[PDB]
């Protein structure tokens, strides 16, 4: 596949010694005239719910249509922040790391300055038209085909740019192909300013920064070629055609007057190029953002090997669209001069947020804080632990701590409808931080999360050495190797040996396990100092963490609410208490001395026993033993935990139970009820309704009322899961 250009009609020159700089093709003394003609003849642009339409009354065009204003949205302005809020805002097109772009060359191209890429869109659903922008040159029809982009720097490491608009997840490919010669920067700027500003009223698109822009763009007109590649039409002919044609064959063509331009459904540019130009701001924003993320990597300390993960962690749910520039200008230009195939008559994505990684990062931060505050204060009870913890996990604190990573400069916070205070911004930083540390916890090891949060906590580097390097537990401190030596003359460990054999867990320091079973009744002892009210705290923390990770990984299509629900039904009081009772932790409990005649324990107490055992397991071992434990005693029984759960609603129970099903790629739907039979007289009525979850029928009910019938159907669908 080889790329080729049309001949240079004395305009361009490929002379070796007539080149200026690292240029290949130079513009002769015949291009300046054409440029002046194009500039003087096609430069006439700069020469000349009720309250919303009322405020648009000044110089109306046609219909109600929707024209674009420099800085304002469909309803009022698109900005209501501050003066210094410009340089710290990302919607204002201010990316950290972007400086002044050195001007390339006046006319002559820049092969040694511009890196060429070809921009296509897959799949082409809104690409090919019956009336494409076709220009004829040397007795050959040259058809339009995407855009060519010239960057002032290599992309090196940038992921795929995906964006959804026409209810289709489009992919803007930017394949580095051979560079079509015979072009000039001044000409590309002429066409860009004639299209992206004049014809298409696309203001508020800062490709510079308030001098050359960030990316150059050249139209592509291909004629195709046998036994080879294809031929690209040179720029001079593009200018010549756009100049000569600006003077059912008129069907599907874009016309402009002095609104901006409209697409005649009933200049020689049709609804082909315009539609293909509305994908460019998205790609440019994407590239620039991923280019400024390299300055984020040095702030974090950890370099993400997956840009998509970092971006998704930085994405904010305030983004209703994935477009680059102002949504108003985009939709307006798409509806006024976009593509529109002939008519015969003439559900948002919540998984693209950072709420997932926030849901994970909550458990991550919780776990780090819990563990560190646990080991660094072996004398402090549960009260001070929970106090410190709650004092740290606080959202305001997490926001102020998130500012140390300059997350406010890398966040994708969009402008709201009208209300946009500091609260939304700082809160956004707070959540996005948890998303970040969640992602770091995911890709990088847990130790990376420890290092991140630890380094971010204390400003003094002397305090970090203590926080990061927490000492072993007092019951592990006394005995370097193990407590197996102490078993021989142990009173309680003899009992716990059975508990070790029944689970197959051979504890290293049995003092921990003995502590985990020491109820709040007893005080202090030789075998165990204090009760397990600390391991209840730490236990709750590690349980929440592991469960959160499991539900995050094995349910990648469930949003925040679904994961929250499933976790609430996976790790609650009655559940872990039931597990604790099933393992038989009642008999191995430690209370009083001999006052406890029967083995009657409260449900909550059993829950505390399970949590404390998991904490002791984590301390004596690691998170793997915990994960295994919950993988045998919690996770696979998730569905079961919903079946024998407390009743509330057959519909809700069936919904949550069906929420466990093998979700593919589409978000999990809710059980659909379809009425089958409506029989009976005016008095009585026997309704027969069947449940349809994602097509397949699960159970069928027959009741006197519609709600009772569908509840009967839901119950029938719940009995089938037994």
């Amino acid at each position: 596949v080889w790329i080729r250009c049309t001949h240079s009609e004395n305009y361009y020159s490929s002379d070796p010694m007539d080149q200026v700089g690292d240029s290949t093709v130079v513009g002769t003394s015949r291009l300046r005239d054409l440029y002046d003609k194009f500039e003087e003849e096609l430069g006439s642009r700069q020469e000349k719910x009720x309250x919303x339409x009322x405020x648009x009354x000044x110089x109306x065009x046609x219909x109600x249509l929707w024209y674009n204003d420099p800085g304002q949205m469909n309803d009022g302005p698109l900005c209501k922040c501050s003066a210094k809020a410009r340089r710290t805002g990302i919607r204002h097109s201010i990316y950290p790391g972007e400086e002044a772009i050195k001007p390339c060359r006046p006319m002559t191209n820049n092969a040694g300055r511009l890196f060429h890429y070809r921009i296509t869109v897959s799949p082409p659903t809104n690409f090919l038209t019956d009336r494409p922008t076709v220009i004829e040159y040397d007795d050959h029809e040259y058809i339009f085909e995407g855009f060519s982009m010239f960057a002032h720097a290599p992309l090196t490491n940038i992921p795929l740019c995906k964006v959804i608009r026409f209810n289709i997840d489009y992919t803007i490919h930017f394949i580095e192909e051979m560079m079509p010669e015979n072009f000039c920067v001044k000409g590309l700027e002429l066409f860009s300013l004639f299209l992206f500003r004049d014809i298409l009223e696309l203001y508020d698109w800062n490709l510079k920064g308030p001098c050359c822009p960030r990316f150059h763009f050249m139209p592509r007109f291909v004629r195709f070629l046998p036994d080879g590649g294809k031929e690209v039409l040179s720029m001079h002919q593009i200018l010549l055609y756009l100049l000569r044609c600006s003077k059912x064959x008129x069907x599907x063509x874009x016309x402009x007057x002095x609104x901006x331009x409209x697409x005649x459904x009933x200049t020689g540019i049709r609804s082909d190029v315009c539609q293909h130009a509305m994908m460019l701001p998205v790609l440019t924003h994407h590239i620039r953002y991923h280019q400024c993320l390299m300055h984020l990597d040095k702030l974090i300390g950890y370099t993400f090997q997956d840009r998509c993960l970092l971006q998704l962690a930085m994405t904010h749910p305030s983004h209703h669209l994935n477009f680059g520039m102002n949504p108003d200008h985009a939709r307006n230009s798409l509806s006024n001069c976009g593509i529109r195939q002939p008519k015969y008559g003439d559900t948002p994505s919540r998984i693209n947020h950072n709420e997932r990684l926030e849901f994970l990062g909550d458990a991550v931060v919780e776990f780090l804080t819990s563990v560190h505050l646990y080991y660094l204060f072996p004398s402090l009870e549960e009260g001070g632990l929970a106090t410190y913890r709650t004092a740290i996990v606080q959202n305001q604190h997490l926001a102020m701590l998130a500012k140390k990573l300059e997350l406010d400069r890398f966040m994708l916070y969009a402008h709201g409808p009208d209300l946009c205070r500091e609260s939304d911004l700082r809160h956004a930083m707070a959540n996005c931080f948890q998303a970040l540390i969640g992602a770091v916890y995911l890709e990088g090891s847990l130790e990376e999360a420890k290092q991140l949060f630890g380094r971010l906590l204390f400003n003094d580097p002397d305090l970090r050495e203590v926080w990061l390097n927490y000492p072993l537990h007092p019951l592990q401190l006394q005995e370097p190797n193990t407590d197996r030596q102490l078993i021989e003359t142990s009173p309680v460990l003899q009992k716990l040996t059975e508990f070790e054999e029944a689970i197959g867990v051979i504890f290293t320091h049995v003092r921990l396990l003995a502590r985990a079973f020491t109820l709040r009744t007893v005080g202090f002892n030789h075998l165990t100092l204090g009760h397990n009210q600390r391991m209840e705290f730490l236990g709750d923390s590690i349980m929440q963490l592991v469960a959160t990770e499991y539900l995050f990984i094995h349910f990648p299509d469930h949003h925040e609410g679904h994961l929250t629900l499933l976790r609430s039904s996976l790790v609650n009081n009655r559940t872990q208490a039931k597990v604790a009772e099933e393992l038989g932790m009642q008999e191995y409990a430690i209370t009083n001395d001999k006052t406890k005649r029967p083995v009657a324990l409260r449900t909550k107490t059993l829950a505390d026993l399970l949590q404390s055992f998991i904490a002791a397991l984590y301390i004596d071992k690691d998170l793997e033993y915990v994960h295994t434990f919950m993988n045998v005693c919690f996770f696979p029984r998730l569905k079961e935990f919903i079946l024998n759960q407390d009743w509330n609603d057959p519909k809700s129970q069936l919904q949550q139970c069906c929420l466990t099903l093998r979700t593919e790629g589409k978000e999990p739907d809710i059980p659909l009820y379809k009425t089958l039979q409506t029989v009976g007289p005016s008095h009585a009525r026997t309704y027969t309704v069947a449940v349809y979850f994602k097509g397949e029928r699960i159970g069928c009910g027959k009741g006197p009322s519609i709600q009772q019938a569908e509840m009967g159907a839901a119950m029938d669908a719940l009995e089938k899961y037994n």
């Binding site: 106090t387 410190y388 004092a391 606080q394 604190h397 305090l463 050495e465 203590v466």
Partner: peptide, 25 residues
């Protein structure tokens, strides 16, 4: 609010732990 004082006390205790930490050496 109170969390500020709590965090302050935490920093103090960390300074104590660090002082003891290097005191061990």
């Amino acid at each position: 609010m109170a969390n500020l004082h709590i965090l302050s006390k935490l920093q103090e205790e960390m300074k104590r732990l660090a002082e003891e930490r290097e005191e061990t050496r």
